[PDB]
Design a protein around this ligand. Structure first.
Ligand SMILES: [Ca+2]
Ligand SMILES: [Cl-]
Length: 240
């Protein structure tokens, strides 16, 4: 997250860190949202590589013992069947991970609430992106979870020529684009949390930013629209 602030330890308890085995260590690569005690929602592009993955729930600082972490291996991966790694603009950037164990819930570990199917936020709806992604374009990952306030940009504006044009689809949510704050590499797969009727719900799965930079004016961060996949998610969990 570029232009973010440090999140309070218990603000976003559904946020997880998706990590891969690297030598004799683990490295964060993407975020995710805990949606069942044994299921995580992330971006399909985060699991394109055939690596060993684990999820960390109750994580706050990637480099220090928080005293709240639960480490769980990824036992099964179900990527959306229409995802194509060489066509992120087509959408479908979503995947579900079944965990080897069911995590224990507490104030640092809770399920993410999803929006009702088909819900579309009005332009300029207030949301926060959270993640440990780069804090500057071509920078480094954050040590502590960051949050940035990114208002939505509706489809009509987002798909206009000066914004994302034909790249953005109605199956995506755009947010931000002020040139100061945004998601960045390493935030992919994580949540876009938006307050609706007094409750936050996870409306987006971070998918992509501009090749010209994370924080670029009129290139809002683009997320997979969770509300376009409610039936898909329910169907995967029920058959797995
Ligand atoms: Ca930690
Ligand atoms: Cl949360």
């Amino acid at each position: 997250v570029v232009g973010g602030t440090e999140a309070q330890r218990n603000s976003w308890p559904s946020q997880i860190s998706l990590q891969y085995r690297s030598g004799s260590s683990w490295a964060h690569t993407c975020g995710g949202t805990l949606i069942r005690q044994n299921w995580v929602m992330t971006a399909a592009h985060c699991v394109d590589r055939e690596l060993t993955f684990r999820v960390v729930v109750g994580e706050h600082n990637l480099n220090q013992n928080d005293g709240t972490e639960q480490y769980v291996g990824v036992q099964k991966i179900v990527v959306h069947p229409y995802w194509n790694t060489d066509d992120v603009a087509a959408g479908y950037d979503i995947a579900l991970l079944r965990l080897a164990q069911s995590v224990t819930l507490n104030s640092y570990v809770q399920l993410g609430v999803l929006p009702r199917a088909g819900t579309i936020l009005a332009n300029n709806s207030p949301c926060y992106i959270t993640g440990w992604g780069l804090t500057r374009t071509n920078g480094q990952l954050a040590q502590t979870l960051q949050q940035a306030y990114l208002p939505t940009v509706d489809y009509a504006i987002c798909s206009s020529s000066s914004y994302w044009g034909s790249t953005v689809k109605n199956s995506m949510v755009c947010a931000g684009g002020d040139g100061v704050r945004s998601g960045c590499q390493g935030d992919s797969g994580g949540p876009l949390h938006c307050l609706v009727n007094g409750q936050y719900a996870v409306h987006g799965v971070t998918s992509f930013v501009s090749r010209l930079g994370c924080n670029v004016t009129r290139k809002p961060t683009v997320f997979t629209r969770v509300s376009a996949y409610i039936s898909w998610i329910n169907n995967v969990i029920a058959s797995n």
